[PDB]
């Protein structure tokens, strides 16, 4: 047809008796409800009620997997620094004499690399939302 069948022009479509006695549920699901996101208690990205849920419990460590903000090593400029025990112990804050060229050479790849890993994790959420997330419709199992 021309529209999706899980919504009506007034909200979500009531299916069972619960929906018909409590029709708040059809038009309100958190401080981030929007008429496009109706009922779907995952709503947009970044807004409230957006987290994908893996079998009931919701997901909030999406970067903490890739290693952004979880276990930040990235090693590309890190090995460079740890190497330069001269320009690590100098006034540690110059384009100092020689090695701060190589420090920024490593970091130039760090930047592109972490942009690629971040886009990876963005596509990861946008995949795991398709083909794993129950959308919080199944009961918790983390307890």
């Amino acid at each position: 047809r021309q529209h999706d069948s899980g919504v009506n022009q007034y909200g979500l479509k009531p299916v069972n008796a619960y929906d018909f006695i409590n029709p708040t549920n059809l038009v309100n699901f958190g401080r981030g409800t929007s008429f496009d996101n109706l009922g779907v208690r995952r709503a947009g990205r970044g807004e409230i009620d957006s987290s994908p849920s893996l079998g009931g419990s919701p997901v909030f460590t999406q970067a903490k997997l890739v290693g952004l903000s979880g276990e930040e090593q990235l090693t590309m400029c890190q090995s460079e620094t740890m190497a330069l025990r001269v320009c690590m112990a100098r006034g540690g804050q110059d384009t100092c004499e020689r090695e701060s060229r190589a420090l920024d050479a490593c970091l130039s790849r760090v930047g592109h690399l972490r942009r690629a890993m971040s886009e990876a994790c963005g596509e990861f959420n946008d995949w795991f939302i398709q083909n794993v997330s129950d959308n919080h419709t199944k009961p918790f199992q983390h307890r």
Binding site: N25, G39, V40, R41, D49, G56, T137, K138
Partner: protein, 136 residues
């Protein structure tokens, strides 16, 4: 008491399909149209003559996962490969050329002929590979 966020509108995970099974619409349109006060959809005029298959029960009722319910969605040469990567791909590099006889195939046939002629497993392996390399 924290219940699952979207739980309230969850679907009944076992009986959410059954509304949609083609047999339900066959049973439910057969009478709607038998009444004589209805103009059957064009799909009924057809899937009446070709009713769906009988035994494609959903796994949600046949509580058996190992059961190949649907006939459509159904599903040695390991070493003939690990010994020659040209033997594998000889019709299948870009898209399995599924109508030309294949070297992996004829080497399986050769293998069995040899092992019934009585050559041990390992030696039929070598003789198959050497006969392939030769014909190459």
């Amino acid at each position: 008491y924290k219940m699952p966020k979207n739980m309230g509108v969850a679907p009944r995970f076992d009986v959410w399909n059954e509304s949609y099974e083609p047999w339900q619409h066959m049973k439910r349109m057969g009478r709607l149209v038998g009444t004589g006060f209805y103009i059957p959809p064009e799909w009924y005029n057809h899937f009446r003559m070709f009713p769906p298959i009988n035994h494609n029960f959903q796994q949600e009722k046949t509580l058996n996962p190992r059961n190949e319910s649907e006939p459509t969605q159904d599903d040695l040469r390991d070493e003939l490969a690990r010994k020659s990567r040209l033997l594998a791909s000889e019709g299948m590099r870009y898209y399995n050329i599924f109508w030309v006889r294949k070297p992996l195939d004829r080497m399986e046939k050769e293998y069995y002929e040899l092992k019934r002629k009585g050559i041990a497993h390992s030696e039929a392996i070598k003789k198959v590979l050497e006969g392939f390399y030769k014909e190459l």
